[model samples]
Structure formats: C-alpha cells, structure tokens
Target: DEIASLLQVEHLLDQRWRIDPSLTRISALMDLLGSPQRSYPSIHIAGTNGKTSVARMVDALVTALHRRTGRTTSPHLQSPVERISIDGKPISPAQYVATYREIEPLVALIDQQSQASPAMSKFEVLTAMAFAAFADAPVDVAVVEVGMGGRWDATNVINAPVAVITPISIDHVDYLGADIAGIAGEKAGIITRAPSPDTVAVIGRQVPKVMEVLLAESVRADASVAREDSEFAVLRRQIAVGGQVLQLQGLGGVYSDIYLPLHGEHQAHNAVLALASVEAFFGAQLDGDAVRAGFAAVTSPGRLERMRSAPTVFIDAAHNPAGASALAQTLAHEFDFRFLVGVLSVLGDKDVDGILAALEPVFDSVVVTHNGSPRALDVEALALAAGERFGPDRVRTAENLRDAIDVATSLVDDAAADPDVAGRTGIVITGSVVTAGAARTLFGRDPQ
Candidate 1:
C-alpha cells in the first residue's frame, strides 16, 4: 500500500501540469482541508536566488533555539519529499505517501468542483501537502519558500509575521516578465500578506529599482522594513577551513564569531537575512551561543557542494545568471583549482548565454549535456551557446549526463598529467538544480 501510494503521488506530480496562476484553487483546497497552514506562525521567503539557502538557515536557527521547525522548499535535489522537512530532516517516503493520500480525495474533489478555473498544479498540491504534514507535525514555526512569483504563488497563502526576501533578480521572465520593477512588485506581495503593523519584512540587498519597488510596497502595507545594508548586514567574514566565519548584524543584536558551513559571499548575505528574519520572529535578540550553534549546523546541498576529491568535483544548483555569477565568484576567491572543467546543462527557457558568460572566466573548459528534466535544453544547443562564450576549443558536447561527467572528469584528470598545467585540478557540475541533483546521485552522494 505504501509503494502504491507513492506511485499515485508520483503520477500526480508529473511536471506537465500547466501553471494556472491563481490563488483560488489553493485557497479552496486549504479552506476545505481546514486551513492547516494557520496552525503555526511562519517565516515566508521569496526572491529569485538564495531563497532555499535562507529558508534552511532560518530553520536551523529556529531549531537551535529549541523550537520545532518545519521547512518547505521547491525543485528538490532528489525525491519530491525533500521539499518538506520537520525538525530539519526530510519526511520519510512513507510519510510523504501518507500525506499525499490524506489529501488525494480532496484534491480530486477540488478538481471536480472547479467550474471557473483549472485543476491544482503540482506546485499547488505539493504546497498543500507540505502544509498538512507540517500541521500534523505541529511545528512551532514553519518556513515556506515561494515556488514562483510571490503574489499568486500557492505558498503565499500563509500570513507569516516575518517575511524574508532574498536578493531579487531578473529571472522567470516568462511568468514575471523582464522588467525588474515588475518582478520586484510580485515578490513584494508576501511583505504585505501579514496585515499586522508589527509585521517585519527582512529585505536582502537589491538594485536601486528593486529597492524602490519593495520600499513602496512596504510603505503601502503595515509591514516594517529591514533593509540588508542599512538595518542588518554581514559586518565581516573570513574563509575558514570547511566553511566561513561570519559576523552578522541583526535587528535585535550583532552576533559575532558565527561559523557557517557553506561557501560563497552570497551565503554570508543569506545568513544575515536568515538571522534578521529569525530575530524578528522571536521579537528579541538571539543567544549568541545559540546563533553560533545554529549556523555551525547549517548545510546547503548543491550550492557550491563538493561531491568528490582527487580532480575535485563540485555541484552547484545555479540555474540563473545571478546564481552562476555567485558560483563563479566563489570559485574565483574561495577555491584554487588550476584547470577547472565545467559540466553544464540548463533548462530550455533559461538564459543559457548569460549563464555561460558568467561562468566562462572561471571554467577552463566545459562539457555540455542535458539533465533528466523534460525542460532541459538540448545538449547540442547548449554546446553552441557555450562555444559562443567559452570558444569552440573550450567546449565539448555530450548528449548524456553520465557521458558529460566522464568527459569533464577526464579533462580534469588529463590536466593533472600535463606539464603545462600546475596546482589542484577540479570539475564543477552546474547549470540547474536538476543537473546538480543528477550529478550528486551519479557520484553516490545521498540526498540529504
């Protein structure tokens, strides 16, 4: 029965589901299901990049402070169940099936009763299922990450007291448009969702236009704003042995000597954002020891995650230009790989050229391939795009991901034997979350 239930859930999660951009379906489902999301206070997170990292950080911080926390993020690295976590661990496969089965009849009923709109999307159903599971766990606080544009995102239903917006950028052009202000406008919706005057919006660093839009939205609502550089910031950070040590200035207090087990300067920014959000949620300064303990426990898989050593291999889920830029910057500063080879694949709708351009300076050569996603851009097209940015001499084509890894690792291995090349050789597998996930599996890394 458990296996059968999992099969049913898998069928329901088919990615072919269309994006019916309305809150009505999710709202109706929640209403019929007794609004399980209202069972606990929450911290709602939205933005183009770093949302997942920030969400996990918040969960860790809250849990370290001895609160039962639930977190739900999207585009899971392995199983769909990875999207939902209780006490900082993903639900068991059986639990995922049970949660889906609990809502199966209602999902069908909601589909049948809908006369004016389409059925619930996979994202919507997944959002609903997460809420049910979190409520069943009866968490003290839940951290929710928006799937897409915040205004109509199914996860936006929760009126979280503290809303965190990680760095906003120009991705999701199809759904949110290319205009920077428009995307910021949509992401600003979560700040106003909580109608209380005491609600706080933890705003990450943004460009002038995005800041203007977010500030305007905050003023229009009862929410108080906490800008990254102005209110709370990463005061100082030093690259450490396994991760980085950070001194973060939060709203309540300045926490120093915090060790974050994650790479990149962007993650330091995410740490501050998460700290401010958690401080706002508690309405007080956190214990410094607890803050340190919380951060030390943090781990962001696939974001600059090193999978293997000896011709060292890493995987990062950088699907956008901004994310790729962050990954490049991290590799440039934090790592010293002498002849880095990149294994890249992106979605059909992504800015392939932009991502390739961002990574070109850091990668000596790239092997282009496709992930398992139906939306994966063809390997040939990706190679052509890579050729334009990285030059044809630096671009290699592999139709399959396994071949791509073999090709890229072989390049790194060959660099080791070359008299022309010196220092540590490495490989970076990136382009999209799916790509990172697939590579992680191929390397025998468990989906934690």
Candidate 2:
C-alpha cells in the first residue's frame, strides 16, 4: 500500500477509537512496523519543559558528527510535519509519503489487531509514524520526545540509549502522579538496560532527591544513571534578548561560549541537560567547537519567541507558575514597554493566581483573553481576578482570541501615539501552549 493510503487508514483508525491512557494499542502498532523502533539508536527526553529544545540540541550535535539524525517532538505549533524532522529540517512530503508506504502493511496488521481490542490514540499513531520514518530514512540516531508522561507513553517502547529529564514540576498530576516525585518516577521510566547508558539532568539542590528516585528506577530496570550537577554541570548563566550563552563543564569536556537561541532562565537549565546527553552519546566524537556551534545555531520557536517589528510581540508557552515567573523576570530585565497586553489560557492544574501575581507588576494595562480551548477560563472571570490586583481601568476582557489581540494591539497603538509614551509596547502572549500555538498559526510562525 502507498503511504497516503496507509496514513488514511491510520487516520480512520484514530477516529474510530477514543484515545485513553494505555500502551497496549501502541505496542501492537510497533510490532506491525517490524519493530523498526529497534533499528536505530535513540535518545529519549521527557519533562515538563524544554523537551523540544533538548531534542533539537541533540539532533544538531548528532548531525554535526556527520550522521543522519531524526528528531520527533510534540504539540506542534503549525503543521504535523514539524513534529518530525532530520538535521533540523522537517521531512519532505515525498519522504513522508514513501516512508508511510513502507510501514503501511505493518500499520494495517496493527490496526487489525487493534480492532480485536482497543485502537491506538492519535499520538500513538504519530509515534508509530516517526519510528517508521526514521527506519525508512535509516538515520544513525533518532531523538524522541515523549508525548506525555513517560512510563506509558507510546514512545517509551524503544530501547533508548540515553534518557533525559529536564525538570519536574506539578503539572499533569492526573496522568503521572500527584507529586513531584511521582512525576519523576514516570519521567525516569525511559531508562533501559539495552541502551547500555542512561543519563539524567537535574538541578543543583534537587540532586539528592532526584537521584534517589532515578537510581531506584535504574536499579529496578537494570539501567545506568548519571545526574546533572554531580556527573555534569553548567557552571555559569547569562541572559539576553535573542538568547543566552553559558559555560559548561561535564563528562564530554569543558565547553565554553555555548550559545542557546532561546530566552529565559529555564532554558539555561534545559541546555545543561542537552549538553550532558550529547556528552553521553558522542563523548570523544564531540568537541567544544561542535558543541558551541550546535548550541549557537539551535532555536526553539514560541519559547520566549518575539514576533513583529513595532510594539514588540513575545509569545511563550509559560503555562505554570514557574514558567510565568521566568517570563516576568525576562520581561522586566530585557525590554521596557509602555504597557503589557497579555493573552492567557491555562490547564486545570496551573497556579492561576501565582501567574497573574508574577506578571501584574510589570504591566500598566492588562487585557485578559481566552484561547479557543475547552480548558480556557472565562474571560470575565480572569478579568475580574486581574482587576483586583491591577484595578478595573488596567484590566479588561475580550470576547475572543482575535479580539484580544486587537485589544492589545490597539492599546499599544494608543500608547505609541502619545509623545511622552512613544516607545515600543510589549505584548506578551502566554499561559498555555495552545494559546501560543493559536497565535503562531495566526501569525504564520512555528509555535515552539
């Protein structure tokens, strides 16, 4: 069967089943793909933040080693094609079609098997596609990001050579576990013995607790483990508008002048994980020069990404309190604006009040708007809450997302019209990846 036909079949199968949390359907699909997931070496990254950035950095370093590299990341900002890439470029349409064709028979077999039981979810199918694509492309290595929690995620099927955990926070409590340790356990599930070595990147003070959880999981699974601050470390941190540069000393070598083209302090921590993973993967094959180049060149969109010229617009996927704090800090340090226009949509578990508290002081005016999602809060409710802290004159609600953007833009224009306030107004679009994704689609940029 052709790739198009196979994709059609997969799409139909996806529609047939309501995606629930289980690995059985995905396991069956992998069997159909001739277990191509086992054909290539892979680095598995799972975390609350910076998973995509870590994956991209690993991809760049591997590609620099003169090997064909494939990367699979999730929650695409624009097209589904962006989820799958090789050497930083998305797979071509012809390649996607041909690759899908190769895996069609196996996909059909999996579908048939699934019919006897439950069907695969949309994400599981996409994971299957990535494995098939990487196998067909015959890349030397593939960097895979888990769609959600790692233990039962569809991408967890592969024997990963290295496993990376950026940082654990209180998000996705329902799927993973209720606490940080529980989330750590799920993220550590990617560790595998067949991979020979497994490395984990964690913060300085959190090392002991994270190591305790990770080491227990590694021993139970018979996998090797490496912790960030103990085994590898990022010694220095700096911040800037375009990105950041840092000094790292770790297993691979002492890497100086490593530049990352993403904003915020959280990204600096993510870079540490990426560097550690690269060191674990290549070791002697990688040098400071390649590492520096990779870090300097790699970029993640929608992660403190700035769009537009006059009245600067910044888009970020800062859905939680931690992320919101980082965004607020960056806004304070990097640029000065007359007022701030904020578009926020958040999930159920987020710290709503904390996020608003972090952001309120920086802006003179705040327009609360909603993204088109079921999880989004009522605009009036958000405005009411913000009004308490920022006052009624500074807080207003928009009917829809487009109207929200217009409201913010008009405020910026109004401020710019005044000679005394004739400076670029800063517009921050944040709160959820969905909101950032919608904004990116509207503006024709990839949502990081």
Candidate 3:
C-alpha cells in the first residue's frame, strides 16, 4: 500500500499532542504550495468536545445542497487518511498517498529551508494534505476542525468565511492554559480576521466566560455573529427511535421536525449550530429541506455509536469531563443499561479525575484497559486514578482491550443474574479516539 510510504512521512514529525506550537513552518509550506487552503471558502470550527461532530454536520449540510465540500477533522478514529474528506467522505487511502506524494517535495523543502523553522509536525503535514485535497476537488466550501488550540493550529491557514465555536471546555490544559477564558481566547484566534458579513461566527452554547470572550472577539473581528440560544436554537427535542427529533431555529428561519441521527441533547444543540452556520454562509437560499435531509442523514461515528449487540457494546471518544458528563447523561436516559461497565483507557494528560467523576455515577463497574496508544495510561495507573472517584471495589484492570471486554461482559452477566440487579447490562468503551477506534476495530468496524 502507498499508505506505507505516507506513514513514513508521518513518522518524520513528532506526535500531534506533543507540540511546540508555531505556524511559521506551516505558513511557509502553504506559501510554497501556492496556499491551496485559500482556494475555497472555509468554515473553521474550534472547541473541546463537539468540534468534530459539528464540523461533520456542517459538511453534511453543505454537501446536501449538491455542492462539492471538503471537511478536515483531527485525531482520526481509523486512519490518518480520514483526516481529510471530499464530498462528505474520507479521502481513500490511495488518494491520501497520492496527495501526500504531490506535497512530499514541498514538505522537505520547508524542512530543509531553515534551521530556525520547526520541522513540519504530523498535524502540520496532514493539514497541508487536507488543503491540497480540498483544492484538488475545487470544493465550494471546506469545514475544518482544529487539532488543538485554534490560534497556532496548522489549520488556521485558511481565512474561513464561517467560523464555529462548539461549547468550549477545559481539555488541553498544558498547551492552552488553565483559565477557561485563556483557552477560549486561543480558540478565538480563528475568527479574528477583518470584517465581512460573508464571514460569520456561529457561536454554539458556551459557558459565561467563554461566551464573553468569544462574543467580544467576534465583534473585534467585525464578523457577523450568530449565537446559539439567542439567534439559532434547538426549540424542541424528543427522544426518537433511532436517535432524536429536533425543531431547530436556523439563521434565516425556523426549521421544523429535523431528525438528527445522533444521541444526547448536546448533539441536538450541535444540529442547530451546524444549521445556523450553513444558513449564515449561503444566506436565505440555504433551504429547510436541505437542512432537514442533511441532519437526518448525518452520522457522527465514535460518538455514542453502537458497535455490537448481544450485550450491547458501544464505542465513544469522550476524553474530557464535559464529554464524559454528556456520555453519562446519555447512558442514564437514552440507553437501558442496568449494569453498565466502562472499559476506560485514557491518556495521562487528561483530567482523569474529572472524567471518572462524571462517569462514576452512571457506570456500575469499570474495567480499566490499555488502548494501544503511545499516550495511553497504564491500565493499573488509570485504575488507581479511577479508584479515587469510583471507589476501589468498582475499579478493575485488564491486560488488554480483549481481556477488558471479556471481563466487563462477564461481570455484567453475573450482575444481571442477581434479582436486585437490573437487566439489559452492557459495556461502553470510551476515553480517547485511539481507545474508541481500537474498540471499533476489535468489534469488526475497522476502516483500515
């Protein structure tokens, strides 16, 4: 596979999470490549939890209008090839390899040009690849989700016509800083371009501090701002058979009975943000039918997604406290899990205490396991951390994911046998994308 060759290029740079944030190399590289990212109108999305989902939703809604679309998201669940998508699909491995080959010479040139300039990181190289792919497709629009903080993130190369902020929360405390305001400030960089009505900031629901920083930044940038609750809102949401039904208010008008195929009230909110962003981009012509159909057909993989049935196994990439809280709420209300077992494998950098605390109430028993990521917390270490919140009795460890599943299922099976224990017990494998993606592959959904 040519993907093997691309993987070699990938290893040339450091990991995405391990970052010395500078966009100079990326800017110079994009300059060398004729700035392909500027070739199309782009919608820049930045946030902690729902950025990827909102980006995907924006992509879906834009593509439904019969326009060619490009979408770039981060920390791919399956393969690096998935980081870039054209027309609502991840570029094929063949295409990924081909695209990288096009920029291979330019990337090396950037690395060789100056000793002072940082070598292209994994994320930087991939951001270049995504821009190249999008430009090659000559997409009408591109929906881009930042890998980390928005300001210095390599994807900031694009002067997006539309920018989305998806409910900022504390996640990358090391790079973005501790103050939620400071993190939101860094993300606010994506929208700080000079004013234009064509350039709109679609503000999703934010905490008070986040909203203040973002809204002020939006005004400073002179971009038209469409807020979530004040402007566009999810007027109504009721749990439905497959997912949920939403009556959302878009930018131009109120859209009714929109069926979004994803879990959580947070997702319903993402729907409205996506709708509002698209509507803001195309103005009044972006029709309700397209919005309705776009949302109805959207799929946010690795987000409360079902993998297996017998014991009802699920895989989600909820790596933070807010995300964990959302996952907890969904587990409590959406699924009928009487004895839920959490197969959790987290990164060492995350707020393990907060994530576990959010999930502790919902998960009856948790099996700490390794997700096979370089950043993966040791099963024993994560179990020790989880014990602080879940208590020692509820925390257990497994050598690997396979063992974790086996142990979790067995525990649930035994618990369900008890008269006092509720039935319909299941396992939820979550934490990092690496963990969820590994579980997805383990359960036979491997895209690789």
Candidate 4:
C-alpha cells in the first residue's frame, strides 16, 4: 500500500481540503518549482458538470492527432494517480511515487518560503505535481480541468489557448454562492488571463446569465470566442446501437457520421465541446479520420457506464439535479427496462431532495445507502428523503452497499421472473462520484 499511502499526504503540512480562492500560493509554488507549467500550452476547462469527461475526450482526440499529451482532471474516480494522465493513461504508481520523490525537496522549500494558508493544500500540491510530470514528459499539450471555481483555482496558473465551460448550473452553492451568474463569473477566469491573440474560449450552452457572464470575461480579456449554438452545434443526435451518432457543426466544419460510444445527450454535448476546443487549439481544421477515430474510441467511465450484467447494473456520477434529470431521460430513451431500482448515496452538501425528485419516476424503488465518504449523507435521513419522493412503501434502506445492490438486483430478478414480461429490468447506482467509484472497486472493475 505504498502507492495507496501517497494519496493521503494531504496533511503534509496540516493542509485540509479548504478552498481559499486565491492564486498566490500555487502561483508562488510554481515559481519556486521553476515554473514547470510554462513548458507547454494547455486547454483549461471549467464547469458545473462534464468537465472531466470533456477533458478526457479532448485528450483522446489531441493524442490521436499524433502529439504527446498530458491531461489532468480532479476528484479522480479511482486513484489519485488517475488525476494525472498521459495519453489517457493514468500515471503508474511507480511514476506517481517518482514524481513525488522528485518534487519532495521543492515542496518542502515551498512550505518554508510561501507563507500562504495551511502552507500548501492537497489540491495545490497535486496541481504542482501534475505540472512537474507534464513538463518532464515534455508533452506537446496539456488538457487541464479546474478543480473548483476558475477565478481562484490553483490550476489557473498557466495560460490556456482554448478554455471550455460545460453547461453551468447551480451547484457548489457553498463556495460559489448559489447564483448561476456568480459561478459562471468564477469559471470565466480560465477564458483568458490578460490579452492574447492565440487564446480561444469554447463557450458551451448555459443559462442566459451564465452565457452573458462568461462572454463578458472574454470581452475583458479580448480573447477569440466561439458560441455553441452559433459557432457549432449538435445538429442531429440519433441513438444508435451501443451509443449514438452525431452531426456536430464544429469550428473547423461539420463532422458527421461520428459515433460516440457513450450514453446521454449531455455526453453528446461534451463530445462536440471537445471537438470544437481541439479545433480552436489547432487553428486549422482537424483530420476528419482522426476526429472520427478519437470519438469512436472514447469512453466516459463512472458516467453512465455499465459495471455488471444479468439485470444490467449501470453507474453514473450524476450528483446534481441537472445531471440526474439527464440520466433519467437517457435511461428512458436508451434502455428497455420496465423496472429499474436506484441505489443511491450522496454527499451531505448535495441537493438531496432535488436529485431524488429528479430520479423518482425513473426508478420503481430506491435503496438509499451510505458510501465511504465522511460527507456521505446519513442513511436514515436519506431514506426519509427518498420516502418523501417515492412514498414509504416504495423506499428501502440498506446500511450496507453490497447488501443494497443485492436487494436491488433481487427486485429486478423478481420483476423479470414473470412469463408474460419480455422487457428488461436493471439497477442504477449513482448520486456522487465517490459512490460510483466505490461501486466500481467493489465489483472488481478496473479503472478506465
């Protein structure tokens, strides 16, 4: 468990997961690390949802175009190593250890010199480590997803040529303050720092105020801008065999006959955002063959991914009401399940009632369970909330997740036992990314 132990060094100097919205600490840390982040141009992405998936899509397509790529996304589904990837592969534990070893000296120096809050943070340390790894790899480009709000996020140190904002909604009300416009304003920081002709911001569809705020930031930075509906759009999305086909109107041109093997319309949107972002970075049209190849091979794990079968079990990290709504719609359109049971656990900070209400009608019954997070909702309280949404008789409680999964599968098995029933039945495990990751580990599914 040496590699496993590396993930818990968050307390290297008593640093908590505290979010101090300032760049002084990380900016200075990078300065002391010889500014490893300046070695490559990057694509910085920030959003309420779909940031990680979009970053993965961009990395796949960019690497397909034959350039070494470095991609970093936060709150990894499985391991801390999953956050720092090269060519879509998470850094090996050995490499992670080596990177830590190389940076240990510098980090200690930063701790001594940089007089910031908590000396340095878990996120800041990880961000620095990613930069060091990317610089040493000397990758041609980096796809960086913001850990939190952009304005003060640690990853905002480098100037990104193309910045992406996926559909913004009201989540992270604690740090972001519940206003869609305010959150958009924070995320808008990645668009451009000052002024640069090379900068391009891929503006996604959002609430009117979100769109307005991000564009306003773009104007202040005077960066080139491309809007989703105006510049490029998902012209048509037809559900296909495994996933769906899309005719995306990208910045370069319309790329059609593209099959992305992922579920949900939101993922379709993520695909096009990735397409347009890469196109903006290239400043020239991408090879259609490479584009199609990348999209065809893309997979967004812990996102509408099927982890088990025989009364198929699907897991999605749809923590918010917006994501839950999309999951419900995708299930209805994509699957033939007559009876689906939801096994859910969420963080205490999430919109519990809203998420339960969104998925209430999709699942015949819900088994409210707790995940292995300190912030995981109290099981009894969550079960009560589920009861409010699905009625007392329809809601169940399982203090154990494996037991919950068994109960859900048995419910599906019971439903499918009917001779007259020819329809499929299944279970959906969701609520938080941690819960989805936990399910993957419990089922012995390797990280993608």
Which one wins by TM-score: 2 or 3?
3
Estimated TM-score for each candidate? 0.97, 0.88, 0.95, 0.95
Residue-by-residue lDDT tens digits, candidate 4, 103-153: 878777766776543567778888889999999887999999999889899
CA lDDT scores, all candidates in order: 0.88, 0.74, 0.85, 0.86
**How many residue pairs clash (N, CA or C atoms closer than 3 angstroms) in each of the candidate models, in the order given?**
0, 2, 0, 0
RMSD of each: 1.8, 3.5, 2.1, 2.1
Model 1 agreement with the true structure over 1-448: per-residue lDDT tens digits: 8657776778867842845566888898999999999889889999999999999999999999999999999879977778999999998889999898899899988888875446678888999999999999889999999998788899988888988888988665465347888889999988764544467888999999999999898887778889999999999999998889999889987899999989899999999999999998988778999999999999888899988788788999998889999999999999887889999989987878889989999999999998978989988888889999988999998888899889987788788878889528888999989999998888887667
**Candidate 3 residue pairs in clash (backbone atoms < 3 Å):** none
Give the alpha carbon lDDT tens digit for every residue of 304-343 in model 2.
8888868788888887766788788888776666567777
Error of 1 at 307 (Å): 0.6
lDDT of 2: 0.74
User: Candidate 3's error at 407, in angstroms?
Assistant: 0.7
Q: Sorted by lDDT, highest first, which candidate order results?
A: 1, 4, 3, 2
Better of 1 and 3 by TM-score: 1
